[PDB]
Enzyme design. Structure first.
Site, short mmCIF file in Angstrom:
data_model
loop_
_atom_site.label_atom_id
_atom_site.label_comp_id
_atom_site.label_asym_id
_atom_site.label_seq_id
_atom_site.Cartn_x
_atom_site.Cartn_y
_atom_site.Cartn_z
N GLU A 109 -21.48 -91.14 -89.79
CA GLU A 109 -22.49 -92.11 -89.40
C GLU A 109 -23.90 -91.61 -89.62
OE1 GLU A 109 -21.92 -94.48 -86.02
OE2 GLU A 109 -19.77 -94.72 -86.40
N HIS A 159 -23.38 -97.05 -86.84
CA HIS A 159 -24.34 -97.03 -87.92
C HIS A 159 -23.63 -97.23 -89.24
CE1 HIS A 159 -25.37 -94.47 -84.56
NE2 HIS A 159 -26.65 -94.64 -84.81
N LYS A 206 -26.22 -100.10 -79.43
CA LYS A 206 -27.18 -99.78 -80.47
C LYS A 206 -26.52 -99.91 -81.84
CE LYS A 206 -29.40 -95.76 -82.64
NZ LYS A 206 -28.90 -94.43 -83.00
C1 LIG Z 1 -29.79 -93.87 -84.01
C2 LIG Z 1 -30.54 -94.50 -85.15
C3 LIG Z 1 -31.66 -94.01 -85.63
C4 LIG Z 1 -32.62 -94.90 -86.41
O1 LIG Z 1 -32.15 -95.76 -87.18
O2 LIG Z 1 -33.84 -94.76 -86.21
C5 LIG Z 1 -32.24 -92.70 -85.11
C6 LIG Z 1 -31.11 -91.77 -84.71
O3 LIG Z 1 -31.66 -90.56 -84.18
C7 LIG Z 1 -30.26 -92.45 -83.65
O4 LIG Z 1 -29.30 -91.62 -83.02
#
Ligand SMILES: *[C@H]1C=C(C(=O)[O-])C[C@@H](O)[C@@H]1O
Ligand SMILES: *[C@H]1C=C(C(=O)[O-])C[C@@H](O)[C@@H]1O
Lengths: 252, 252
Positions: B86, B143, B170
Site C-alpha cells: 500500500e 490505499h 481513510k
Molecule cells: C495515508 C495517506 C497519505 C497521503 O495520501 O497523504 C499519507 C500517509 O502518511 C498516510 O499514512
C-alpha cells in the site's frame, strides 16, 4: 485550444487571470474607484455599467469610460452592462443596450465587451461582427441566479456561444447543493477537454461554489473574479487571497 | 455524524485538521526530526514506522515512540506502519505487524494507530477491540497507488471500515485523469451526506489530485496531509501553504 491576447495578457494560458469589477454610481464615484483600484493587483478590469445611474446618456457612459481608461491605460478593460434578468442592477431596452455596446466598441475605449447570449441571436451576431471589425473581443455570457442546470445543458450553451463567435464563453450558475458544484466543475472539464477551442470562464456562485473560483487551473476556467472592496457577484473573495490560492495551486 | 476528540482536538468539526508525517531511519534521526517538527504548525503528528529501519526489535520501536512523545507531549500521535503493498517502505509478517500495533497501544505512547483494512477481518476486528479497550483510536485505511476505483466501490470500502469499528475511515487513490479526481470528491460527498456517521479522510494523490487535499471542508474530508520537509505521499504540499488555503476557504 486558441488563446486570446488582450494587451500584454494571454488568456487561456497559464494561471487563471484575475478579473475585478468596478462599480460606480456616477462619474465622480467611477473616478474615485478607478484611482483606488490602482493600488490593487489584478489582470483585467471589468466596468459594471449597470451600476452607473446615468446610463440614459451615451455621452455620460462614454465619459465615464474615458475616466477609467485614463487611470489605468494598461489594464485590459471589459465593458459590461449586466441586465437585471441575469443578476444586474437595471433593465434597459435591447436597442439602448446595443447602442451603448456599439458606442463603447466605436470609441476605442474598451478592449472587450460582455454580450449576453439570450439577447437574441441576430443582435448578438451583429454586435459580435461589429466588435471584431473594431478589434474588440467579445465575452459572451449567461447567468442563472436560481439553479444549476445539467452539465449537458451547460455544455450546450457554451458550445452555442462558440458558434455565435464568442471569443470567451462565460457561464455562472447558482448551486443549491454541493452536488451542483461538482456538476459545474464536470461541465467545465468536459468543455475544456472535448469541445472548447478557445478560453472558457465558468463559476458556481455563493459560498458553496467558492471552490470553482479557485480550481480554475485544474478544471479548465481561464479566468476568475475576485473582490477589491465589494463583490460584483456572490462568492467572490478578496483578490489578495484569491491570488495566493492560485499561485499555490499553480506551483504545486 | 460523530466526532473524534483526541486530546484537545475535535476531528470531524470545523476546518479540516492538518496531519504531517515524521520519517526517521533510526532513533537519532527520529529524535532530530521530532525537534525540528516542533517549529511547524500542524494538529496531528503521524509517525511512519515503516521508514524506521530497526522495526525488528519491539524495544527499538517503542523507544523511538517515547522519544517523539517526549518532544511533543501535547500533539495527538498517530502510529502508522504502512506496508509496501500500500505504498510503504517495508514488508513484514502480519503477526509482527499486529505485535508492533498491540505493543504501541499497550505502552500508552500513542493516541491513534493506523490499521490497514485488507490486513484480514478477524485480525483487524481483534486489534480494533484492543485499541478501544486501551482508549486508542483507530484510523482504518486503504490505499491504491495505481488507479481510482469507482465511486460506488470506494463508498463500499469506507462503509466496511465503519462496520469493522474504524473511528476514522481513510482512503487514498491514484488519479489517472482529472476525471478520477472528480470521482474521488463525489465518493467523499456521497459518503459524508448519506452513510458516514463518523469522520472520514479521503484524498486523490499526485499533482492532479492536489485539489482534494484542499477542498476537504467543502466535500467532507475531516483531515488532510501536508509536508514539513518531505512528503509521505505524492501530492502533499508544504504545511504553511496548506494551512493558508484552508483558512481562506473556511472564512469565505
Ligand atoms: C495515508 C495517506 C497519505 C497521503 O495520501 O497523504 C499519507 C500517509 O502518511 C498516510 O499514512
Ligand atoms: C459575470 C459573473 C460574475 C461572477 O460570478 O463573479 C461577476 C460579474 O461581474 C460578471 O459580469
Amino acid at each position: 485550444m486558441k488563446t486570446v491576447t488582450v494587451k500584454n495578457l494571454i488568456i487561456g494560458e497559464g494561471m487563471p487571470k484575475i478579473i475585478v469589477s468596478l462599480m460606480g454610481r456616477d462619474i465622480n464615484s467611477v473616478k474615485a474607484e478607478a484611482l483606488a483600484y490602482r493600488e490593487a493587483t489584478f489582470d483585467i478590469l471589468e466596468w459594471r455599467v449597470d451600476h452607473f445611474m446615468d446610463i440614459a446618456s451615451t455621452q455620460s457612459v462614454l465619459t465615464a469610460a474615458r475616466v477609467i481608461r485614463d487611470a489605468m491605460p494598461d489594464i485590459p478593460l471589459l465593458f459590461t452592462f449586466r441586465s437585471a434578468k441575469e443578476g444586474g442592477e437595471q433593465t434597459i431596452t435591447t436597442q439602448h443596450y446595443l447602442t451603448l455596446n456599439r458606442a463603447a466598441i466605436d470609441s476605442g475605449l474598451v478592449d472587450m465587451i460582455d454580450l449576453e447570449l439570450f439577447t437574441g441571436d441576430a443582435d448578438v451576431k451583429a454586435t459580435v461582427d461589429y466588435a471584431h471589425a473594431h478589434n474588440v473581443y467579445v465575452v459572451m455570457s449567461n447567468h442563472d441566479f436560481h439553479q444549476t442546470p445539467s452539465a449537458e445543458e451547460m455544455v450546450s450553451r457554451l458550445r452555442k456561444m462558440q458558434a455565435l463567435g464568442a471569443d470567451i464563453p462565460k457561464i455562472a450558475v447558482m448551486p443549491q447543493s454541493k452536488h451542483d458544484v461538482l456538476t459545474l466543475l464536470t461541465a467545465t472539464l468536459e468543455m475544456q477537454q472535448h469541445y472548447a477551442d478557445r478560453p472558457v470562464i465558468t463559476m458556481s456562485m455563493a459560498k458553496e461554489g467558492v471552490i470553482s473560483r479557485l480550481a480554475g487551473e485544474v478544471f479548465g476556467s481561464a479566468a476568475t473574479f475576485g473582490a477589491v472592496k465589494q463583490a460584483s457577484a456572490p462568492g467572490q473573495i478578496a483578490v489578495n487571497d484569491l491570488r495566493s490560492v492560485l499561485m499555490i495551486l499553480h506551483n504545486a
